[PDB]
Amino acid sequence: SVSIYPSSAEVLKACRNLSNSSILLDKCPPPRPPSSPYPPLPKDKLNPPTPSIYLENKRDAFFPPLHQFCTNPNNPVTVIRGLAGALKLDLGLFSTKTLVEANNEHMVEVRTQLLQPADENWDPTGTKKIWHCESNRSHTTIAKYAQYQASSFQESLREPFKTIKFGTNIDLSDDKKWKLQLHELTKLPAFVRVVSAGNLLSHVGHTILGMNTVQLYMKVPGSRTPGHQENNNFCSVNINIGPGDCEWFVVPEGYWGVLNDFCEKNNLNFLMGSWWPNLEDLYEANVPVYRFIQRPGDLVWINAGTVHWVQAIGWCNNIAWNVGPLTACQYKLAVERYEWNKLQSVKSIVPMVHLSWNMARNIKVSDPKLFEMIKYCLLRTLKQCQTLREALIAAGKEIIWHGRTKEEPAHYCSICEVEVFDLLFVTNESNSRKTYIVHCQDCARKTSGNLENFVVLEQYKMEDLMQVYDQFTLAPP
């Protein structure tokens, strides 16, 4: 166990001395979208079968190799067949009828869409296949969406596209409204649980809605979730409640640069836009597509960075959340997309700096590659904080001890939405109002070169950070 990182004292001494030798190369290669993977795949390998686990007994679910099979980078997606039945999960707790009985006034975000044929997406005139996926936002209650979902089923029983409505992003975070639902999910094995010691998102220290909390989706046939990677490339878990089936389309992480280019050529934003890929385009470009059906009770594991899009075939509900395996692969993909998001001016829903410092306090990391990635992160941010701190003092500006409360979330810049760690810039008016509306350093200087209109709040004792950094060391196996 040879340590390759400077001590916190050494970092601090190097930040004071403004001649000397360097600690590290501050410059760093900026992120970019990858080129199409090498080696390329021939046409006969562009429709690969889906990695599948066939569960029969509760015991099968707790088999340790299941974990490694799902996180294997070579498996972009895994369908765990018969999960609900092997664990005797009561999916009825998530039926529309049960949900209405429990919280009939609960909010539902509604996406109004066009009912498209099979795997295709046509412009609204039925004239040509396009990538843009019309999906307009409104809001309703569980009671009113339940009513639509049920009558929709009745019209079909009886006997230029039809408009449909998709009930999405239903917040199941409140354990006093959903106690029975959330308790049922504690029956799952650790590696897919919402909360776990082995789940990086359980170390964020606060709620990230829909990632470390459960979301529900209420669907009618044709309800589409457009193409996306998960927030900061975290893995995802999804269970179909039924009674109908869902159809999944999946592209390996390695190809997201190719899909980003398809989005740009089609005048769409990869990260933030609404797009449904044309499968003939993907085929022509040698992009492999995993396509499969998720039945009621089947669990779908979306591996880190997997590009995917989904549509209901029948009437069904789904539940979903994110997990973060404690692996070098997952941490690396999360930090890369954290960096890419900054370049793109897209908010990182997972505050990777805040989270890395929490990981360093709480987790004994025994894998060298993961450990080095985390400590490198601590080093870069520790150095950034002490460098900023020095420049402020040397400029006469004062640093107000602000501290932070139990579970205080990470703060972001109200202008560019970057994470702002440790040193917060707020205007004097937002200071007194205790709206504490945070800016990053760059956005503050844009409105006040000398920071006259700004106070600087400090969240952590530098000595606290220096100690967490020095006590984060490679754990024994």
Ligand X SMILES: O=C(O)c1ccc(O)c2ncccc12
CB of 239 to ligand X, least distance (A): 9
User: Could you say whether residue 377 binds ligand X (CB under 6 A)?
Assistant: no
CB of 346 to Zn ion, least distance (A): 13
**In this complex, which beta carbon is closest to ligand X, that of residue 203 or of residue 308?**
308
> Each residue of 119-156: b (16+ CB within 10 Å) or e?
bebeeeeeeeebbbbbbeeeebbbeebbebbeebeeee
CB of 389 to ligand X, least distance (A): 40
133 is in an annotated binding site: no
Query: Which of 381, 373, 376 is CA-nearest to residue 353?
Result: 381
Distance set, CA 241 to CA 4, 86, 225, 316, 428 (Å): 50, 15, 16, 6, 51
Cβ burial, residue 352 (10 Å; 0-12/13-18/19+):
buried
The structure tokens listed for 403 are: 């501290």
User: Could you say whether residue 416 binds Zn ion (CB under 5 A)?
Assistant: yes
User: Do 438 and 424 meet the contact criterion of CB atoms below 8 Å apart?
Assistant: yes
**In this complex, which beta carbon is closest to ligand X, that of residue 294 or of residue 427?**
294
d(CA 293, CA 287): 20
**In this complex, which beta carbon is closest to ligand X, that of residue 8 or of residue 223?**
223
Residues in the chain whose C lies over 2.5 Å from the next residue's N (breaks after): 18, 159
372 is in an annotated binding site: no
CB of 451 to Zn ion, least distance (A): 14
Question: Residue 322 binds which one of Zn ion, ligand X, none, with CB within 5 to 8 A depending on kind?
Answer: none
Question: Residue 320 binds which one of ligand X, Zn ion, none, with CB within 5 to 8 A depending on kind?
Answer: ligand X
139 is in an annotated binding site: no
Pick from 218, 307, 413, 424: which binds Zn ion (CB under 5 A)?
A: 413
**In this complex, which beta carbon is closest to ligand X, that of residue 138 or of residue 471?**
138
User: Could you say whether residue 318 binds ligand X (CB under 6 A)?
Assistant: yes
**In this complex, which beta carbon is closest to ligand X, that of residue 299 or of residue 329?**
299
Query: Which of 445, 330, 372, 336 is CA-nearest to residue 28?
Result: 336
HSE (side-chain half, CA atoms, 13 Å) at 293: 8
User: Could you say whether residue 440 binds Zn ion (CB under 5 A)?
Assistant: yes
d(CA 310, CA 291): 10
**In this complex, which beta carbon is closest to ligand X, that of residue 119 or of residue 390?**
119
Query: Which of 148, 137, 143 is CA-nearest to residue 221?
Result: 148
* Contacts to ligand X from residues 319-348, by CB under 6 A: 320
Q: Site size for ligand X, by CB under 6 A?
A: 8
The 103-132 contact track toward Zn ion, x by CB under 5 A, reads ------------------------------
User: Could you say whether residue 441 binds ligand X (CB under 6 A)?
Assistant: no
User: Could you say whether residue 443 binds Zn ion (CB under 5 A)?
Assistant: yes
CB of 453 to Zn ion, least distance (A): 15
Pick from 310, 426, 440, 444: which binds ligand X (CB under 6 A)?
A: 310
User: Could you say whether residue 415 binds Zn ion (CB under 5 A)?
Assistant: yes
Residue 477, SS3 per DSSP: coil
User: Could you say whether residue 225 binds ligand X (CB under 6 A)?
Assistant: yes
User: Could you say whether residue 356 binds ligand X (CB under 6 A)?
Assistant: no
**In this complex, which beta carbon is closest to Zn ion, that of residue 57 or of residue 345?**
345
**In this complex, which beta carbon is closest to ligand X, that of residue 116 or of residue 427?**
116
User: Do 69 and 75 meet the contact criterion of CB atoms below 8 Å apart?
Assistant: yes
354 is in an annotated binding site: no
Residue 49, SS3 per DSSP: coil
User: Could you say whether residue 135 binds ligand X (CB under 6 A)?
Assistant: no
Residue 243 phi, psi (nearest 5): -80, -15
Positive or negative, the Cα torsion across 216, 165, 116, 253?
Answer: negative
Distance set, CA 115 to CA 2, 292, 347 (Å): 60, 20, 31
> Each residue of 366-378: b (16+ CB within 10 Å) or e?
eeeebbebbbebb
Binding site for ligand X (CB under 6 A): 217, 225, 236, 238, 302, 310, 318, 320
Binding-site residue set for Fe cation: 228, 230, 308
Binding-site residue set for Zn(2+): 413, 416, 440, 443
